[PDB]
mmCIF file of C-alpha atoms (C1' of nucleotides) in Angstrom:
data_model
loop_
_atom_site.group_PDB
_atom_site.id
_atom_site.type_symbol
_atom_site.label_atom_id
_atom_site.label_comp_id
_atom_site.label_asym_id
_atom_site.label_seq_id
_atom_site.Cartn_x
_atom_site.Cartn_y
_atom_site.Cartn_z
ATOM 1 C CA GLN A 1 0.000 0.000 0.000
ATOM 2 C CA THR A 2 0.921 3.713 -0.111
ATOM 3 C CA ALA A 3 3.987 4.407 2.060
ATOM 4 C CA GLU A 4 4.498 7.764 3.807
ATOM 5 C CA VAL A 5 7.740 9.321 5.088
ATOM 6 C CA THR A 6 6.581 9.376 8.764
ATOM 7 C CA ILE A 7 5.864 5.628 8.552
ATOM 8 C CA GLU A 8 9.284 4.773 7.039
ATOM 9 C CA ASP A 9 11.248 6.975 9.500
ATOM 10 C CA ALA A 10 9.304 5.759 12.566
ATOM 11 C CA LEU A 11 10.047 2.294 11.154
ATOM 12 C CA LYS A 12 13.805 2.819 10.795
ATOM 13 C CA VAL A 13 13.931 4.247 14.363
ATOM 14 C CA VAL A 14 11.948 1.163 15.466
ATOM 15 C CA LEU A 15 14.752 -0.960 13.913
ATOM 16 C CA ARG A 16 17.283 1.357 15.590
ATOM 17 C CA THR A 17 15.966 1.019 19.189
ATOM 18 C CA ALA A 18 14.743 -2.587 18.850
ATOM 19 C CA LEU A 19 18.282 -3.353 17.567
ATOM 20 C CA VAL A 20 19.682 -2.521 21.002
ATOM 21 C CA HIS A 21 17.082 -4.853 22.567
ATOM 22 C CA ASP A 22 18.902 -7.738 20.810
ATOM 23 C CA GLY A 23 15.832 -8.458 18.673
ATOM 24 C CA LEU A 24 16.607 -8.219 14.957
ATOM 25 C CA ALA A 25 17.255 -10.519 11.980
ATOM 26 C CA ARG A 26 19.321 -8.598 9.423
ATOM 27 C CA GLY A 27 19.352 -10.169 5.984
ATOM 28 C CA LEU A 28 17.158 -11.933 3.426
ATOM 29 C CA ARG A 29 17.915 -15.444 4.736
ATOM 30 C CA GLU A 30 17.693 -14.709 8.481
ATOM 31 C CA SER A 31 14.397 -12.825 7.971
ATOM 32 C CA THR A 32 12.856 -15.520 5.728
ATOM 33 C CA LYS A 33 13.841 -18.141 8.340
ATOM 34 C CA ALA A 34 12.467 -15.662 10.909
ATOM 35 C CA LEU A 35 9.126 -15.725 9.045
ATOM 36 C CA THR A 36 9.115 -19.539 8.573
ATOM 37 C CA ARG A 37 9.322 -20.209 12.365
ATOM 38 C CA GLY A 38 6.717 -17.589 13.352
ATOM 39 C CA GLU A 39 9.405 -15.427 14.977
ATOM 40 C CA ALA A 40 8.892 -12.233 12.964
ATOM 41 C CA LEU A 41 6.618 -9.758 14.769
ATOM 42 C CA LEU A 42 7.207 -7.220 11.952
ATOM 43 C CA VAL A 43 9.269 -7.383 8.733
ATOM 44 C CA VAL A 44 10.969 -4.481 6.955
ATOM 45 C CA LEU A 45 11.536 -4.742 3.178
ATOM 46 C CA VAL A 46 13.587 -2.301 1.068
ATOM 47 C CA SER A 47 11.921 -0.700 -1.988
ATOM 48 C CA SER A 48 15.235 -0.428 -3.893
ATOM 49 C CA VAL A 49 16.698 -3.952 -4.092
ATOM 50 C CA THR A 50 17.932 -4.517 -7.667
ATOM 51 C CA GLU A 51 17.291 -8.253 -8.112
ATOM 52 C CA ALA A 52 13.550 -8.984 -7.878
ATOM 53 C CA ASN A 53 13.702 -12.813 -7.713
ATOM 54 C CA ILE A 54 13.786 -13.315 -3.894
ATOM 55 C CA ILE A 55 11.426 -10.298 -3.700
ATOM 56 C CA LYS A 56 9.091 -11.855 -6.304
ATOM 57 C CA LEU A 57 9.072 -14.762 -3.834
ATOM 58 C CA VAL A 58 8.473 -12.442 -0.813
ATOM 59 C CA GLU A 59 5.912 -10.374 -2.803
ATOM 60 C CA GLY A 60 3.865 -13.552 -3.275
ATOM 61 C CA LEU A 61 3.668 -13.860 0.513
ATOM 62 C CA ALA A 62 3.222 -10.088 0.917
ATOM 63 C CA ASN A 63 0.152 -9.859 -1.340
ATOM 64 C CA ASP A 64 -1.211 -12.995 0.360
ATOM 65 C CA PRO A 65 0.007 -12.703 4.006
ATOM 66 C CA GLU A 66 -0.542 -15.165 6.874
ATOM 67 C CA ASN A 67 -2.291 -14.385 10.213
ATOM 68 C CA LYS A 68 1.103 -13.942 11.884
ATOM 69 C CA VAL A 69 2.863 -12.104 9.008
ATOM 70 C CA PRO A 70 2.843 -8.266 9.017
ATOM 71 C CA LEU A 71 5.217 -6.456 6.625
ATOM 72 C CA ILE A 72 6.219 -2.851 5.859
ATOM 73 C CA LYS A 73 8.395 -1.080 3.241
ATOM 74 C CA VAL A 74 11.329 1.351 3.625
ATOM 75 C CA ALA A 75 12.961 3.589 0.982
ATOM 76 C CA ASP A 76 16.629 2.534 0.656
ATOM 77 C CA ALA A 77 18.979 -0.440 1.218
ATOM 78 C CA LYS A 78 22.101 1.225 2.678
ATOM 79 C CA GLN A 79 19.997 3.128 5.244
ATOM 80 C CA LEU A 80 17.971 0.106 6.381
ATOM 81 C CA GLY A 81 21.406 -1.401 6.868
ATOM 82 C CA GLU A 82 22.411 1.746 8.792
ATOM 83 C CA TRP A 83 19.519 1.613 11.313
ATOM 84 C CA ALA A 84 20.219 -2.078 11.884
ATOM 85 C CA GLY A 85 23.778 -1.164 12.941
ATOM 86 C CA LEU A 86 25.134 -2.354 9.594
ATOM 87 C CA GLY A 87 25.229 0.089 6.652
ATOM 88 C CA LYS A 88 26.477 3.098 8.610
ATOM 89 C CA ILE A 89 26.964 4.120 12.261
ATOM 90 C CA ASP A 90 26.637 7.923 12.326
ATOM 91 C CA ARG A 91 26.297 9.874 15.588
ATOM 92 C CA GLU A 92 26.977 13.493 16.647
ATOM 93 C CA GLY A 93 30.754 13.337 16.128
ATOM 94 C CA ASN A 94 31.417 9.702 15.191
ATOM 95 C CA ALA A 95 31.143 7.738 11.915
ATOM 96 C CA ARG A 96 31.695 4.159 10.637
ATOM 97 C CA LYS A 97 30.798 2.647 7.232
ATOM 98 C CA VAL A 98 29.536 -0.882 6.433
ATOM 99 C CA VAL A 99 27.233 -2.156 3.603
ATOM 100 C CA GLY A 100 23.415 -1.948 3.520
ATOM 101 C CA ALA A 101 20.758 -4.642 4.055
ATOM 102 C CA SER A 102 17.770 -5.699 1.931
ATOM 103 C CA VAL A 103 15.297 -6.901 4.595
ATOM 104 C CA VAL A 104 15.279 -6.935 8.439
ATOM 105 C CA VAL A 105 12.945 -8.729 10.946
ATOM 106 C CA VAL A 106 11.955 -7.567 14.471
ATOM 107 C CA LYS A 107 11.809 -10.708 16.673
ATOM 108 C CA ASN A 108 11.949 -8.945 20.061
ATOM 109 C CA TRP A 109 10.437 -5.452 20.351
ATOM 110 C CA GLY A 110 11.291 -4.280 23.851
ATOM 111 C CA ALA A 111 12.007 -0.542 23.778
ATOM 112 C CA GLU A 112 9.682 -0.046 20.770
ATOM 113 C CA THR A 113 6.555 -2.079 21.711
ATOM 114 C CA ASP A 114 3.841 0.596 21.290
ATOM 115 C CA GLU A 115 5.666 1.877 18.171
ATOM 116 C CA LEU A 116 5.614 -1.493 16.371
ATOM 117 C CA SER A 117 1.990 -1.870 17.501
ATOM 118 C CA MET A 118 1.203 1.524 15.901
ATOM 119 C CA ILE A 119 3.264 0.726 12.753
ATOM 120 C CA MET A 120 1.562 -2.693 12.350
ATOM 121 C CA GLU A 121 -1.953 -1.295 12.999
ATOM 122 C CA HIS A 122 -1.592 1.593 10.524
ATOM 123 C CA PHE A 123 -0.436 -0.919 7.876
ATOM 124 C CA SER A 124 -3.690 -2.812 8.585
ATOM 125 C CA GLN A 125 -5.375 -0.049 6.561
ATOM 126 C "C1'" A B 1 90.991 -14.988 69.851
ATOM 127 C "C1'" C B 2 94.457 -19.830 70.378
ATOM 128 C "C1'" G B 3 96.910 -23.907 72.590
ATOM 129 C "C1'" G B 4 98.211 -30.161 70.948
ATOM 130 C "C1'" A B 5 100.373 -26.031 79.162
ATOM 131 C "C1'" A B 6 98.225 -28.415 82.996
ATOM 132 C "C1'" G B 7 93.303 -29.349 86.282
ATOM 133 C "C1'" G B 8 88.547 -31.013 87.151
ATOM 134 C "C1'" G B 9 84.036 -33.056 85.778
ATOM 135 C "C1'" C B 10 80.903 -37.019 83.838
ATOM 136 C "C1'" A B 11 78.449 -38.835 79.888
ATOM 137 C "C1'" C B 12 76.696 -46.654 77.583
ATOM 138 C "C1'" C B 13 75.217 -41.323 70.643
ATOM 139 C "C1'" A B 14 82.569 -42.641 75.923
ATOM 140 C "C1'" C B 15 85.308 -46.807 77.901
ATOM 141 C "C1'" C B 16 85.000 -51.311 81.616
ATOM 142 C "C1'" A B 17 82.061 -56.237 82.728
ATOM 143 C "C1'" G B 18 79.092 -58.424 79.798
ATOM 144 C "C1'" G B 19 74.194 -59.125 76.785
ATOM 145 C "C1'" A B 20 72.231 -59.027 71.964
ATOM 146 C "C1'" G B 21 74.313 -58.321 67.737
ATOM 147 C "C1'" U B 22 75.702 -56.185 62.665
ATOM 148 C "C1'" G B 23 79.628 -56.809 59.232
ATOM 149 C "C1'" G B 24 80.080 -63.352 56.177
ATOM 150 C "C1'" A B 25 74.751 -65.943 53.704
ATOM 151 C "C1'" G B 26 69.844 -65.671 50.978
ATOM 152 C "C1'" C B 27 65.949 -62.337 50.563
ATOM 153 C "C1'" C B 28 63.869 -57.025 51.583
ATOM 154 C "C1'" U B 29 64.461 -52.032 51.353
ATOM 155 C "C1'" G B 30 66.804 -47.164 50.848
ATOM 156 C "C1'" C B 31 71.361 -44.467 48.707
ATOM 157 C "C1'" G B 32 75.098 -44.436 44.843
ATOM 158 C "C1'" G B 33 76.404 -46.323 40.112
ATOM 159 C "C1'" C B 34 75.390 -48.158 35.427
ATOM 160 C "C1'" U B 35 71.217 -48.745 31.808
ATOM 161 C "C1'" U B 36 67.360 -46.439 29.813
ATOM 162 C "C1'" A B 37 62.797 -42.855 25.245
ATOM 163 C "C1'" A B 38 62.164 -41.886 30.824
ATOM 164 C "C1'" U B 39 64.157 -44.968 34.658
ATOM 165 C "C1'" U B 40 60.972 -37.457 38.213
ATOM 166 C "C1'" U B 41 63.540 -35.496 42.216
ATOM 167 C "C1'" G B 42 65.488 -33.717 46.849
ATOM 168 C "C1'" A B 43 69.394 -34.490 51.252
ATOM 169 C "C1'" C B 44 63.841 -39.437 55.707
ATOM 170 C "C1'" G B 45 61.266 -36.343 52.676
ATOM 171 C "C1'" G B 46 54.713 -39.209 55.897
ATOM 172 C "C1'" G B 47 59.026 -40.994 50.155
ATOM 173 C "C1'" G B 48 54.623 -46.654 51.061
ATOM 174 C "C1'" A B 49 53.260 -48.573 47.129
ATOM 175 C "C1'" A B 50 49.979 -51.162 38.464
ATOM 176 C "C1'" A B 51 45.495 -45.909 37.102
ATOM 177 C "C1'" C B 52 45.322 -41.770 40.650
ATOM 178 C "C1'" U B 53 49.654 -39.806 43.616
ATOM 179 C "C1'" C B 54 53.613 -37.756 38.974
ATOM 180 C "C1'" A B 55 56.138 -33.981 39.334
ATOM 181 C "C1'" C B 56 59.556 -38.046 34.042
ATOM 182 C "C1'" C B 57 59.169 -40.415 28.662
ATOM 183 C "C1'" A B 58 57.062 -41.756 23.042
ATOM 184 C "C1'" G B 59 53.369 -39.707 20.326
ATOM 185 C "C1'" G B 60 47.814 -37.365 19.470
ATOM 186 C "C1'" U B 61 44.893 -33.046 20.870
ATOM 187 C "C1'" C B 62 42.893 -28.007 22.443
ATOM 188 C "C1'" C B 63 42.972 -22.737 23.696
ATOM 189 C "C1'" A B 64 45.569 -18.460 22.709
ATOM 190 C "C1'" G B 65 46.220 -11.312 21.160
ATOM 191 C "C1'" A B 66 43.500 -7.605 26.217
ATOM 192 C "C1'" C B 67 43.157 -4.240 22.701
ATOM 193 C "C1'" A B 68 44.412 -0.553 19.385
ATOM 194 C "C1'" C B 69 44.399 -0.153 14.145
ATOM 195 C "C1'" A B 70 43.729 -0.759 8.531
ATOM 196 C "C1'" A B 71 40.707 -3.634 4.715
ATOM 197 C "C1'" U B 72 36.223 -7.147 4.320
ATOM 198 C "C1'" A B 73 31.104 -7.476 5.370
ATOM 199 C "C1'" A B 74 24.576 -7.455 5.899
ATOM 200 C "C1'" G B 75 23.276 -8.672 -1.618
#
RNA sequence: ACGGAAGGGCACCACCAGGAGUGGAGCCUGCGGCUUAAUUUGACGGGGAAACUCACCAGGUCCAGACACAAUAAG
């Protein structure tokens, strides 16, 4: 469905603070295995991943989702890597560069419970 | 200080009178020695002793570096 900027930013900060809570699965494989075991409480998929194959497989389970499968889209790959600790680590004075991720799962919420509840309930519409 | 000048004790780790002996024998056990891949080692070691005790040998295994720092990395 139609993705807004508030939704995507609140989402990347959800990945940011639920990353600290030791509750993420950062990668295509770890997130697909996260969704096969019923461990994904919310999944984040990047809207700019070049190869569409694995996505054409995840977009078949996105258009027809299960009762325990909520998803949501972000804007870029390198940045969704960044908020998951990967991609980049940029704070007021410090910087460190890695490479960006395609999809990331939130297994344990913790410090972002009401935020992932809001994000998942506004994607219900 | 030192005496190997002399004088006393005062003693079965000294001598008399003995007693039992040991040293000779086989076996035990400790020390040295040689031999050994090692025959662990101190000068009784609570040192009793096939694993343990092993501290010595022939080989087969693990587990290494706090960290800092440069690349990689999430496709």
